[PDB]
Symmetry: D2
Subunit: 124 residues, 4 copies
Amino acid sequence: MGRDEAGITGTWYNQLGSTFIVTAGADGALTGTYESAVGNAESRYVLTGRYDSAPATDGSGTALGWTVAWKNNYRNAHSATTWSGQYVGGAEARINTQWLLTCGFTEANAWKSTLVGHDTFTKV
Amino acid sequence: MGRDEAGITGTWYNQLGSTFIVTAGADGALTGTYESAVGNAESRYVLTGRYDSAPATDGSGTALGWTVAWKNNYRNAHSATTWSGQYVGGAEARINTQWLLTCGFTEANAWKSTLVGHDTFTKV
Amino acid sequence: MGRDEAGITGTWYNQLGSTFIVTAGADGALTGTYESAVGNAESRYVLTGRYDSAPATDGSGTALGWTVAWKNNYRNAHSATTWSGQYVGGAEARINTQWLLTCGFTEANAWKSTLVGHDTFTKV
Amino acid sequence: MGRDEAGITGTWYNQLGSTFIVTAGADGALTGTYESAVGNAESRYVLTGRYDSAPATDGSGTALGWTVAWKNNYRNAHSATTWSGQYVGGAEARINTQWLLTCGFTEANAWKSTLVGHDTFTKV
Ligand SMILES: O=C(CCCC[C@@H]1SC[C@@H]2NC(=O)N[C@@H]21)NCCCN(CCc1ccccn1)CCc1ccccn1
Ligand SMILES: O=C(CCCC[C@@H]1SC[C@@H]2NC(=O)N[C@@H]21)NCCCN(CCc1ccccn1)CCc1ccccn1
Ligand SMILES: O=C(CCCC[C@@H]1SC[C@@H]2NC(=O)N[C@@H]21)NCCCN(CCc1ccccn1)CCc1ccccn1
Ligand SMILES: O=C(CCCC[C@@H]1SC[C@@H]2NC(=O)N[C@@H]21)NCCCN(CCc1ccccn1)CCc1ccccn1
Ligand SMILES: [Cu+2]
Ligand SMILES: [Cu+2]
Ligand SMILES: [Cu+2]
Ligand SMILES: [Cu+2]
Ligand SMILES: [Cu+2]
Ligand SMILES: [Cu+2]
Ligand SMILES: [Cu+2]
Ligand SMILES: [Cu+2]
Ligand SMILES: [Cu+2]
Ligand SMILES: [Cu+2]
Ligand SMILES: [Cu+2]
Ligand SMILES: [Cu+2]
């Protein structure tokens, strides 16, 4: 059992109103679905990732990350986002992330292929 | 069958001499192992990710991403890296990425928790 | 006179309690001092940057950026931070930024040379 | 006199074929012009920045950064780029950077306001 397996598993919301539904496995796996409130997206997309299933016990956060490729049965935005961040437990648990969204572009446009941002997820 | 399922599946090397061994599934899954030539790492770590399994056919790259949590049976660096990028096919295939490495830190050190970099993977 | 010359000029505070004191020139220059509440820093450091002195008038923010090299008469942390972001006017004006902190490192450690984060500045 | 004042001052080119013309001052100032080979840009734009004028002498690079706001007498792309990186001296001197390009956008589009990339500058 990962230390924060129960704390991570569940439904999370970010500041854009997107919905992140995840299950943390005892082995460090993250599996679930993502629904983005913004951009070229509709409904749920598959996500997978990893988390540190034996974090430090000195008050540090729990490192994790996951990926969504923005293809599902409704749309294909030819892009992928990875979120990299940490789970912070407690009364108001949070997942604090930064993210990289890469679009599949021609070689001449590679310089403008990647957006960077930051999302904060909470359980309410 | 994903368009670039065969082109992605296999063993990749980046400019640091790290080894990225991946299988692309027809459904958009990436599964495999990562071995980093640098940092607080030894041997292979589980990785999972996603890729666009029906990319555009106008010469654009194929968007993808994956995560490694830096825990295995030898070490735990209490951190996770996500790579976000695109697969570029052809005679000298490449996966061009940018990445975010987040460490699990205390709340007071969250400002210095995340490194950013860029890795280029080739098949030789 | 830049459109937001008066709105930008002045004293700003971020969520870490750092102090950003800036003057915007009519030509697009930013000049001032930065005092960081965290890290290897003490007192004020010179900053310089640029801003869009004729922004759009459709409600968009005003793009800007600036650099601090972390050397002053007290300390030298052999590093530089650049903030890239936008000034958002109104009752609760804000400068929303993302930033890159690069340390001068040996060639073998270049992969871990750059931190990424995000700072929000307000006038109170 | 900054340690790398002479090594930095001059004309640099990146992998896109952009031209970075800079003067390093003894006080740590960077001043000059930037001409981008790509994007919504034409001719030269003002740049300003800072560099560590007393770097370590253990083989580490010299940290620096600079900003361009993409307004000049020809065009205004309502955006700013900051480059954060290090000067690496020697036979084939280099400035290795990562950069953040922020567009002035409405509040609803702030999530897609910032591109991230990496540029390598050389003297030839
Ligand atoms: O939206 C998508 C998929 C949805 C992305 C949702 C993002 S994930 C990070 C964040 N957290 C979140 O909860 N929600 C957002 N994938 C293509 C992302 C194209 N751009 C901007 C949007 C757009 C939508 C429709 C038409 C054109 N654009 C990327 C920026 C860019 C780069 C270069 C040239 C032009 N544009
Ligand atoms: O190394 C790791 C795991 C290995 C990471 C390998 C990276 S993935 C991106 C890149 N592509 C690649 O192929 N290989 C590298 N995880 C903790 C990463 C701690 N820092 C730097 C390294 C280190 C090793 C040992 C002791 C201290 N550090 C992060 C930087 C930081 C931030 C704040 C304070 C101090 N340091
Ligand atoms: O603090 C500095 C200068 C102050 C930086 C303040 C930052 S600007 C962005 C942000 N907004 C803000 O208002 N305040 C912060 N420059 C060296 C920054 C060394 N690291 C972490 C701090 C530290 C302080 C003392 C001793 C060791 N570290 C960088 C992370 C790293 C990378 C690789 C290996 C180890 N560590
Ligand atoms: O080009 C500019 C100014 C030139 C930028 C040149 C860049 S600096 C980093 C890099 N190193 C370099 O040497 N050269 C490049 N400023 C607006 C940058 C708009 N986007 C992409 C380009 C574009 C040109 C014309 C029309 C539309 N786009 C940003 C991506 C985005 C985000 C959200 C929605 C849509 N697009
Ligand atoms: Cu430990
Ligand atoms: Cu954050
Ligand atoms: Cu654009
Ligand atoms: Cu399509
Ligand atoms: Cu790249
Ligand atoms: Cu440090
Ligand atoms: Cu305009
Ligand atoms: Cu922001
Ligand atoms: Cu470290
Ligand atoms: Cu020193
Ligand atoms: Cu670099
Ligand atoms: Cu777009």
